[PDB]
Design a protein around this ligand. Structure first.
Ligand code: C6P
Lengths: 419, 419
């Protein structure tokens, strides 16, 4: 008891991640659970890391500026200044962090004090709730729910109850966390939903935290819209991005938070006495990535532009083979995850020997063991009392080699064909 | 007022690093301030990061294991198992972190709760105090004090009051943090000194956090001795290392904590909801760097063995010109920093145009701007009540090319002028 966790980690769980990493190592299924590319990222980013390691400058591999590598943050402000259509100060309005993860951490620790209520949308990215709780905050959850059922559906169909949302704000609301494009639904919030959240933030003096890591992977004909761009919102928005999702190099763990300096000062105090600085040769390589892209921004071969169409064909392909097998897929407006409703297969599969509390866990582990195809359970992304809303579903990642996609389609075809 | 620093970050100011790194960026001095080499680190490690970037393995640049890169944790287990003369589980008893900075953070946040007292030896590495306060703990300081006044002196002369150490230990004491080799002094703790701490931790059931980043930098004839290897000490010690210091790649920001699984589980939990995981290619490169050195642990060519000999000459050179000039240098037993009392020279400097409240701050600023040589003020390593003890000193880094140690002697020699 003496050396037990401090109180502020009451509800403290292992991530669903570990146990599925262990299951995939044991049975070696066709793995649709990892939210990263089967195959290699754009070379030029990669080449830049090799160049920074090989650099003739002795300081390329020594400590860099704590709030962001200079060359890094100059490029960030260039890219974002054009997209948010104001000039972002690279030195005071941009903070570089150990992924979008540590950006989320600096923000939540910097702006959530004991008892502040933070509004979270379900299904949530996994870190959201434990970070709120560790900061002494109180989570307030509200789920996105399909406004239809059967085949045949879009991530725009998953919506909040507007009245519910409204009643969740009061003079105790410190913060709201919105994630768009949404993990794992793929829902890209349209102007009116953003407008809804914006109008509630202004009323209630709430800080909006905008997790825009999949900013660049919105599918035609949908469009990504930043909430820090809406009226009066700049002053009350921290927007978060990630190099790992921007350049498909998730093992690089560099991200950023941008916003007014008044909001960012809070992150800085947390950051300097948490990690202090980030890796120089990686930030250097990302700065050269951004510089390569900044030269050809309007151009189709810009990775920010190209990546949508690269994914879309796999998006469409997966939605097809999952519908073929008897699921109803939610077609994502953006990103690379797909949520599919498998419940009409529940009479065709034997979950008897599966011991998890939740049926999506049973189903997704049975599928690994029985036919060698791994997905992830969406109920791991809900607050205990709402877990029932994710049990009919499964999460698959389609950022995969065309041949591995085709193998998943026939593992499923041949499972159905007999049964 | 809504968006003020939360209570636990109340009275938070920018660190000396955010301030002096920005100072160094401004006036372009000879930088003997923050610790890093101004010349290349081992070529085998730099080559290993280039290879990891260029790897045909498409997992090389994607997420790795959250508690540490499998290949890395194994190498760290192989080495420290030899060094602690026991079998360290790479899986449960090692955590890779973002520098020793996060290893200290995940330790403090994982083991300090509201009202828990922590013993911090002055002058302390400046992160320790604000981290205990962010975790809700009460720091209790004790100064090390030189026992002779000429000269020149050794860092072994800087000693603790044994009665006044004992006094600090009570039922509320959760944690004591020792740093050996010591920053800023270079003090390596002998067996009596570590036994003195060890016995008191065993008597009051306290947790010893051993920050040993400079473990490979002990000069002859002194020796690095690990506190966890003392009797009954393993079950109550977390030992921290850093690849920035082991390999002289400070811009890599990779460190570790090893200790019993019971005490490490707390850390894993903090790491998990902070950054989640660390850079894959960097950890891969550090793993190969250990695999190289493991093959030759007793070779003069081994960097763990070569680096002392390399720094000792630089340390003797620096101690020589600092003394020569009028300063009273403390000659360090390990590491690459040197404290010198510069107060014999306050008639020979003009601090009247510096804004800082502490004299060593004014001193080190004036030197940077006026003569082009940067050091670091030691009062930044003292608790407020005892900052008067660091005012007369200056900390330099002798981890440089001879030509820049000469450039620095030449700056002091001419600045010594005739007045
Ligand atoms: C005693 C001690 N403990 C932990 C660290 C941090 O290591 P990282 O791996 O870089 O995070 C350092 C790094 N020293 C720099 C501060 S940035 C200096 O004082 O010159 C240290 O001296």
């Amino acid at each position: 008891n003496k050396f037990d966790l401090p109180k502020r980690y009451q509800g403290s769980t292992k991530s669903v991640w570990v146990e599925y990493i262990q299951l995939a190592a044991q049975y070696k299924p066709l793995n649709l659970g990892q939210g990263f590319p089967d195959y290699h990222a754009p070379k030029y980013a990669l080449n830049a890391l090799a160049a920074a390691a090989n650099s003739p400058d002795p300081l390329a591999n020594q400590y860099t500026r704590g709030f962001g590598h200079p060359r890094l943050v100059q490029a960030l402000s260039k890219l974002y200044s054009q997209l948010v259509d104001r000039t972002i100060n690279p030195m005071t309005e941009v903070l570089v962090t150990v992924g979008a993860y540590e950006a989320l951490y600096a923000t939540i620790q910097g702006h959530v004090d004991e008892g502040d209520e933070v509004i979270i949308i379900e299904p949530f990215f996994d870190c959201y709730e434990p970070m709120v709780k560790a900061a002494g905050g109180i989570p307030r959850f509200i789920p996105l729910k399909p406004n239809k059922t059967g085949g045949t559906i879009s991530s725009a169909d998953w919506v909040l109850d507007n009245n519910e949302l409204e009643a969740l704000f009061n003079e105790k609301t410190k913060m709201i966390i919105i994630n768009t494009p949404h993990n794992p639904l793929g829902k890209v919030m349209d102007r009116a939903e953003l407008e809804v959240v914006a109008n509630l933030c202004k009323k209630w003096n709430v800080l909006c935290v905008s997790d825009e890591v999949y900013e660049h992977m919105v599918f035609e004909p949908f469009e990504h819209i930043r909430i820090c761009t809406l009226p009066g919102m700049w002053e009350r928005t921290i927007t978060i991005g990630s190099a790992g999702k921007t350049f498909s190099l998730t093992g690089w763990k560099i991200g950023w938070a941008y916003g007014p300096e008044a909001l960012l000062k809070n992150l800085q105090m947390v950051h300097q006495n948490c990690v202090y600085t980030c890796a120089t040769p990686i930030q250097e390589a990302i700065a050269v990535g951004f510089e390569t892209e900044l030269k050809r921004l309007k151009s189709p071969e810009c990775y920010f532009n190209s990546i949508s169409g690269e994914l879309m064909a796999k998006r469409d392909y997966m939605a097809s083979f999952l519908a073929e097998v008897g699921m109803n897929p939610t077609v994502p407006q953006g990103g690379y995850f797909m949520v599919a409703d498998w419940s009409s297969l529940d009479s065709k599969v034997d979950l008897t020997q599966e011991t998890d509390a939740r049926k999506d866990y049973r189903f997704t582990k049975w599928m690994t063991k029985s036919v060698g195809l791994q997905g992830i359970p969406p109920s791991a992304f809900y607050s205990e009392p709402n877990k029932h809303l994710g049990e009919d579903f499964v999460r698959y990642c389609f950022f995969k080699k065309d041949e591995n996609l085709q193998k998943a389609a026939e593992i499923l075809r041949k499972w159905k064909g007999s049964s």
